[PDB]
Design a binder for this molecule. Structure first.
Ligand SMILES: Nc1ncnc2c1ncn2[C@@H]1O[C@H](COP(=O)(O)OP(=O)(O)O)[C@@H](O)[C@H]1O
Ligand SMILES: [Mn+2]
Length: 245
């Protein structure tokens, strides 16, 4: 498959001179994946694949220029490598490769649902097989930092305001989307002017058996993280705020 990869990297214009990008692409992505990107390119969603944003155990994220709804947009292209407790029990999904495709769709559906409810996530564009295209959060091809990446710089912001933004978003996600993120933490919240939630393939509906326990986990993480910055919050008060009690 090595020859196919290099062949698609060539068709995608991912050049040697583009830093370490080509070698990262060729290692983290396979042929069938590149075929999909090229087909998304041919369909007109992707104009130019850009730099590598994140390489992970489950997913790889890249920058691209593309077009959505008639206009040029900056995109995060998230690609799942070709889970269980988070699928089973979520009856929306009628239950190794087909499963990565379902998770991809799940994240997409979760973004759309969260988006429609007024939660701050990246506007979802499209998905195909293991590739998801969404709004790039950041500027000049530089992603907005997650809250862990902000770090001590959080001390020079209105941390209490950021905390309340986070809470408002969880409240909307629960009350209006009827979802629970289930991996909400400082690693999965970005910030530029406002918070954005990301990473939502595992999000579940309020019908999921574990939804409440997931939510309480999410709430504790947020309380724990923000306590390091002098935000005083109570588990009981935050939980009842989210759930509308
Ligand atoms: N829409 C986006 N815009 C800009 N950067 C993004 C976007 N989505 C994800 N990223 C970057 O990629 C990183 C990993 O994405 P994430 O969805 O958290 O997957 P994982 O936890 O599997 O690596 C995020 O921490 C962020 O740094
Ligand atoms: Mn993540």
């Amino acid at each position: 498959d090595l020859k196919k990869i290099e062949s698609y990297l060539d068709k995608l214009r991912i050049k040697e001179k583009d830093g370490e990008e080509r070698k990262i692409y060729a290692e983290v992505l396979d042929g069938r994946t590149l075929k999909t990107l090229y087909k998304l390119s041919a369909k007109g969603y992707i104009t130019a694949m850009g730099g590598v944003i994140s390489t992970g155990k489950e997913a790889n994220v890249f920058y691209a220029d593309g077009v959505f709804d008639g206009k040029p947009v900056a995109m995060a292209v998230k690609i799942y490598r070709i889970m269980d407790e988070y699928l089973y029990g979520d009856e929306r999904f009628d239950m190794p490769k087909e499963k990565v495709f379902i998770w991809t769709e799940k994240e997409f559906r979760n973004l759309e649902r969260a988006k429609e409810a007024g939660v701050s996530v990246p506007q979802p564009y499209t998905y195909m097989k293991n590739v998801l295209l969404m709004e790039f959060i950041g500027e000049d091809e530089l992603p907005a930092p997650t809250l862990v990446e902000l770090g001590r710089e959080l001390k020079e912001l209105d941390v209490e305001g950021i905390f309340n933004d986070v809470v408002e978003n969880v409240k909307r996600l629960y009350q209006e989307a009827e979802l629970v993120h289930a991996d909400l933490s400082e690693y999965n919240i970005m910030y530029i002017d406002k918070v954005y939630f990301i990473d939502m393939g595992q999000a579940v509906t309020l019908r999921h058996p574990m939804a409440e326990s997931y939510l309480e986990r999410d709430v504790r993480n947020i309380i724990r993280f923000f306590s390091k910055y002098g935000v005083k919050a109570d588990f009981e008060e935050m939980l009842k705020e989210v759930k509308g009690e």
